[PDB]
Amino acid sequence: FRKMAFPSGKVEGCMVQVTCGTTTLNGLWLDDVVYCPRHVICTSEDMLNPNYEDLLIRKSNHNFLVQAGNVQLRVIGHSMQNCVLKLKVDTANPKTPKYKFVRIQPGQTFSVLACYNGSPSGVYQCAMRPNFTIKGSFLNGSCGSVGFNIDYDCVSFCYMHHMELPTGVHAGTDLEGNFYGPFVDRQTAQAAGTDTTITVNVLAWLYAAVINGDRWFLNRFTTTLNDFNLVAMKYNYEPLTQDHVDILGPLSAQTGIAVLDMCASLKELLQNGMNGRTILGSALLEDEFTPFDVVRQCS
Amino acid sequence: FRKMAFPSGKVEGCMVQVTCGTTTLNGLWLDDVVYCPRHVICTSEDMLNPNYEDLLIRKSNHNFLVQAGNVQLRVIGHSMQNCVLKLKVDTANPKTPKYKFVRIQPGQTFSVLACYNGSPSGVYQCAMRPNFTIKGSFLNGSCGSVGFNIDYDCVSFCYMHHMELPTGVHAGTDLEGNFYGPFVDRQTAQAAGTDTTITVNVLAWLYAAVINGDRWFLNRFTTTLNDFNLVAMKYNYEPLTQDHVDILGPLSAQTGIAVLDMCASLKELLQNGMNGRTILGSALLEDEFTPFDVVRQCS
Numbered sequence: 001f002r003k004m005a006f007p008s009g010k011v012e013g014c015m016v017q018v019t020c021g022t023t024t025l026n027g028l029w030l031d032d033v034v035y036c037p038r039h040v041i042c043t044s045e046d047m048l049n050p051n052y053e054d055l056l057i058r059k060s061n062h063n064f065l066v067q068a069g070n071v072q073l074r075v076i077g078h079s080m081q082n083c084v085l086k087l088k089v090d091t092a093n094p095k096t097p098k099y100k101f102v103r104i105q106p107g108q109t110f111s112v113l114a115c116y117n118g119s120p121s122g123v124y125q126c127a128m129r130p131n132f133t134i135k136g137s138f139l140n141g142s143c144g145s146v147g148f149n150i151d152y153d154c155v156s157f158c159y160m161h162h163m164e165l166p167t168g169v170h171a172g173t174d175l176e177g178n179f180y181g182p183f184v185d186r187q188t189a190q191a192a193g194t195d196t197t198i199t200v201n202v203l204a205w206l207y208a209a210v211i212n213g214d215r216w217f218l219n220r221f222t223t224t225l226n227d228f229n230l231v232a233m234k235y236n237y238e239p240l241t242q243d244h245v246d247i248l249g250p251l252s253a254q255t256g257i258a259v260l261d262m263c264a265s266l267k268e269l270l271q272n273g274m275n276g277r278t279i280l281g282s283a284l285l286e287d288e289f290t291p292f293d294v295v296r297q298c299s
Numbered sequence: 300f301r302k303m304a305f306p307s308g309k310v311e312g313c314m315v316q317v318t319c320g321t322t323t324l325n326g327l328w329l330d331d332v333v334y335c336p337r338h339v340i341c342t343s344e345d346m347l348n349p350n351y352e353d354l355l356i357r358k359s360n361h362n363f364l365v366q367a368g369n370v371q372l373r374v375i376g377h378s379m380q381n382c383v384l385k386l387k388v389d390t391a392n393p394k395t396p397k398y399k400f401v402r403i404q405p406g407q408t409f410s411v412l413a414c415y416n417g418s419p420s421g422v423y424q425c426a427m428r429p430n431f432t433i434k435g436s437f438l439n440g441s442c443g444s445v446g447f448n449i450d451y452d453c454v455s456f457c458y459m460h461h462m463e464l465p466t467g468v469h470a471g472t473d474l475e476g477n478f479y480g481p482f483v484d485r486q487t488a489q490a491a492g493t494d495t496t497i498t499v500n501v502l503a504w505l506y507a508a509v510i511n512g513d514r515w516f517l518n519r520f521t522t523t524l525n526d527f528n529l530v531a532m533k534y535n536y537e538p539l540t541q542d543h544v545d546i547l548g549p550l551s552a553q554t555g556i557a558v559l560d561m562c563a564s565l566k567e568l569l570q571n572g573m574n575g576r577t578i579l580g581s582a583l584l585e586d587e588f589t590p591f592d593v594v595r596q597c598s
């Protein structure tokens with residue numbers, strides 16, 4: 001059982017380079033529009049406290065250099081939507097996949113295609129944390145890299161990368177430019193509050209452990225939803241609900257282990273630790289696989 | 300710092316479906332040749348102890364059904380090379396990337412494009428273990444999935460998937476059909492011997508930890524190559540060598556931490572454990588990032 005990303009090919013063909021002045025980052029080219037973070041228009045002396053409206057007023061279509069491979073695209077319009085720019089170009093991307101824009105929920109997962117200079121460097125899987133950050137791997141030049149899911153042949157874009165927080169975690173927007181969480185695109189100290197553990201995902205991963213033969217942490221106790229949650233709260237775990245219980249249905253069925261039984265084993269792990277043992281090769285409790293991810297992978 | 304795979308698009312366009320009888324698995328379509336595991340010709344009653352030469356003698360070109368999307372390809376020749384079949388087809392793949400076949404060394408890493416029915420399902424990063432197994436995620440139908448590295452625009456194929464061992468780890472071949480390790484493609488119990496930890500990779504990951512601000516495990520001791528290795532052997536770690544020390548050069552330089560100093564910290568971690576703390580978000584010592592991987596990711 002592995003952290004598995006979606007195949008990235010459909011997204012690779014949408015990545016372009018966008019330069020304004022000496023600032024370069026990545027853009028996403030779908031039909032005749034290129035989407036990118038609006039801070040492409042900032043100089044380093046603007047990033048402390050930009051007035052983006054005023055900055056963009058000094059920019060014309062020809063100040064945006066958009067490059068797809070060795071091919072410069074012609075910008076024929078521009079507008080700002082929340083924290084993203086939309087650059088209308090004179091060529092529709094011939095590689096545009098079937099796609100939609102979605103705003104994901106916290107606790108859900110997606111794949112990131114990390115890019116530099118409009119060129120893909122690598123792919124990995126991320127969760128939107130309950131505090132609306134992601135634990136990514138991003139350097140200078142990575143902004144405009146996107147996160148996505150694939151359903152059949154349709155790419156659902158859900159994330160565009162903008163910034164790193166002082167804790168080393170990452171923040172960004174949906175493809176309409178609205179940040180996940182309370183963040184703003186300016187280079188000031190910003191707090192993500194307390195993060196919490198995605199309880200239903202830990203359970204899904206414990207189920208995945210059982211499916212893959214790892215069963216040592218199972219005990220002979222059970223518990224109640226309200227009793228467990230009294231333990232969840234203690235550990236900054238999200239409360240569990242019947243919808244969670246139901247979502248776990250397929251896994252609880254494949255394994256014959258009641259969700260509340262699995263909860264009792266989780267309580268003991270939270271209380272007693274793992275005694276130097278491992279679960280699916282990890283010595284910590286993993287919360288960045290959804291139930292769907294586990295079903296998808298073990299099917 | 301994340302387990303990061305290569306972008307998979309160039310490989311996605313090489314995957315096809317190969318059926319012989321009711322056995323279906325994946326093939327790799329490059330120029331006018333499709334490569335796949337030879338056990339595609341086995342029935343379930345053949346897999347216990349196949350005579351592949353005899354089995355293949357009863358097969359003709361038209362018994363191999365090769366499908367790329369909705370498109371059946373015409374097989375015009377077939378031959379067996381070690382544990383792979385080469386099916387000559389009448390159409391050269393128009394999506395063939397620049398490519399080579401390489402036999403990787405143990406301790407090196409690569410990306411796996413896990414496929415079913417010739418369709419990519421997901422991508423993840425693997426190391427060739429010192430005992431020539433990989434810790435993958437593979438189900439029935441995944442054989443013929445490949446592992447690769449990308450250098451610039453050139454895909455270096457290094458692995459084709461064939462089998463799971465009783466321990467749950469995975470074995471397969473290079474693209475000439477020669478198994479990594481002592482394995483044979485028959486459904487009998489086979490041992491991978493003792494695995495060992497890839498010492499230079501653990502050090503590279505400790506360097507990656509330091510680069511990313513995690514420094515608690517550093518101590519004020521140093522050691523000798525021979526003294527450390529007396530500790531390495533104790534823990535089934537690979538011995539460290541000057542070539543390893545030199546390969547770590549760039550990281551030792553970026554950090555100002557002598558390799559033998561980092562070795563002394565590693566010795567203490569092996570001896571004293573991690574006292575419930577974490578390094579790059581892991582509570583175990585990670586050995587599936589090479590020095591190159593760490594340089595690539597932190598650059």
Ligand SMILES: *[C@H](O)[C@H](C[C@@H]1CCNC1=O)NC(=O)[C@H](CC(C)C)NC(=O)OCC(C)(C)Oc1ccc(Cl)cc1
Nearest residue numbers: 025039047138139140141142143162163164185186187
């Ligand atoms: C866009 O490519 C870049 C991505 C971050 C750089 C470091 N790791 C990232 O994910 N985003 C920014 O630089 C962003 C622009 C603001 C206008 C929102 N600033 C930001 O993320 O500040 C946090 C710090 C740690 C200061 O990030 C860095 C900024 C500049 C440099 Cl040279 C290094 C880090």
Ligand SMILES: *[C@H](O)[C@H](C[C@@H]1CCNC1=O)NC(=O)[C@H](CC(C)C)NC(=O)OCC(C)(C)Oc1ccc(Cl)cc1
Nearest residue numbers: 324338346437438439440441442461462463484485486
């Ligand atoms: C090829 O798609 C398949 C891949 C393994 C299936 C289970 N996980 C794998 O990686 N390879 C085989 O089935 C292989 C064929 C032999 C001719 C070499 N047999 C094999 O791997 O045996 C090990 C076991 C655990 C028996 O694998 C399974 C075989 C069949 C089935 Cl239905 C389930 C598991």
